[PDB]
Amino acid sequence: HHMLILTRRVGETLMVGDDVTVTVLGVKGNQVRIGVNAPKEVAVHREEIYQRIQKEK
Amino acid sequence: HHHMLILTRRVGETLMVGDDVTVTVLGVKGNQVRIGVNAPKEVAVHREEIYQRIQK
């Protein structure tokens, strides 16, 4: 394993497995707006929220 | 059943998908966003337009 590195332009989508999609919705400066679709049972978090959740579990 | 989420990430910032996948913004050039995905060997990662072609 290692990290996979690709370009996605505004409007383009990457898929993690068969059931999760991650779409680039927009870019302003160093900011990317991102849309995620996923199964209800699959949690999606900003890292900072994910790590707080992990410390509480 | 599904849920949807819209968020903002700056270059260097990361979102987690479940417990075993992360997607990180590595760079921005115009409308192009460079992204890094870490995921288990057993979890395929596709560009959707390529995956849609494979499906035919």
How do the domains of chain B map onto residue ranges? 1-56
Sign of CA dihedral A47, A52, A53, B1: negative
Taking a C-beta distance cutoff of 8 angstroms, is the pair A36, A43 a contact? no
**CB distance from B7 to chain A under 8 Å?**
yes
Structure tokens at B39: 């995921």
**Resolution for this PDB entry, in angstroms:** 2.0
Nearest CA in chain A to B55: A18
Report d(CA A23, CA A12) in Å as an integer: 6
Method for this entry: X-ray
The most distant pair of C-alpha atoms in chain A lies apart, rounded to whole Å, by 36
Distances (CA, A) of B6 to A2, A6, A46, B50, B56: 27, 20, 11, 23, 30
**CB distance from A6 to chain B under 8 Å?**
yes
